[PDB]
Symmetry: D2
Subunit: 117 residues, 4 copies
């Protein structure tokens, strides 16, 4: 109510929120090699508006072999989307990552680092 | 799949498809007055990839976001879209805009033209 | 738009809206029918839609990964919708077409009631 | 990937992921009074597939088109995540004084 989380905990909470939000808002977005940098930037800028987010790095890894289809384009998906987000509440930073992990066959979300400033 | 569909008909159909897709793909995107043009631009470029789409003009109309998070969301209240589809010799002008009188973001066709 | 043109436009709107509203939804083999039905019901609220049939085609192999689930996508999602505006109907379809490597949307049929 | 992350903090991370995912997957979904229960059920079932999610309760509290959409205004959610011996209860609800749909953790508790 609504302040039970210490801010280390909040930094972890907000990294989780931003990773899930980014993934679900943007997966499905039509994208090409020519687009894919500008889309990545809009995603970062959208992530940087969320509570406690102080850094967002997004890559949408698309190549022309991904656009060999009637449409001539592909979509943002767990397969081509990679995100690092840094969150800071008070003196604590958390580092959240999204990346398709081949061995897991799955776009994993994890906490890379939790860090006192 | 398009053996009997006219180009005129496809222009209309693709404008509908593109407007539904934009709306549902981008509604809920965190936005602020400072993002809002760049968000518009990525929406445009995403639109321009889809079949028959030869033009797209988007605005996200966001003012000074007074709330806890300090931002708003792309929605039917703030999203304005005009797209032009061209299939063969036919163009449709498709539009999306909140129509104050109906209380709803309306999608419509402004013009169909050769 | 005349009623016939409205029938086509609304079918395109509904396919586009459904595809991008629902893709990314987590789904498993026995999810897969309740999700399909949720999609039908949302399609039925759109102007002119009078029939919606949705299949979400997921097998245990699609779910052979760390999470144990998959997501609704261009590859597993099939939709037929029927629009009626006034005296005219349009049948709109969505399906992954292998030869095209693409989830194509198209008009199967335009016909008088 | 989780060698150094405590299960307590994983429970918190996953709650956050699931609330953000729910919110952004489903906002925009056409809904009406007769929709609105069944929609909530599809959301819970979608939420329940996610890592560590063991419980999900959703309400959708419902012009030209004759319908409305799942939004931050009408969507309410409580999830329980369980990782190892720890549980977090995550909430999403519109808070009037904040004029914002807040996501927050209501409690973290031992199993
Ligand atoms: Mg939305
Ligand atoms: Mg999606």
């Amino acid at each position: 109510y609504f302040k039970r989380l210490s801010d280390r905990e909040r930094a972890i909470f907000e990294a989780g929120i931003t990773l899930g939000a980014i993934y679900h808002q943007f997966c499905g977005t039509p994208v090409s090699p020519g687009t894919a940098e500008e889309v990545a930037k809009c995603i970062e800028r959208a992530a940087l508006l969320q509570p406690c987010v102080i850094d967002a790095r997004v890559e949408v890894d698309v190549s022309s072999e991904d656009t060999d289809n009637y449409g001539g384009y592909t979509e943002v998906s767990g397969r081509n989307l990679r995100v690092t987000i840094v969150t800071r509440c008070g003196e604590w930073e958390a580092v959240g990552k999204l990346e398709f992990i081949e061995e897991l066959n799955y776009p994993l979300m994890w906490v890379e680092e939790i860090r006192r400033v």
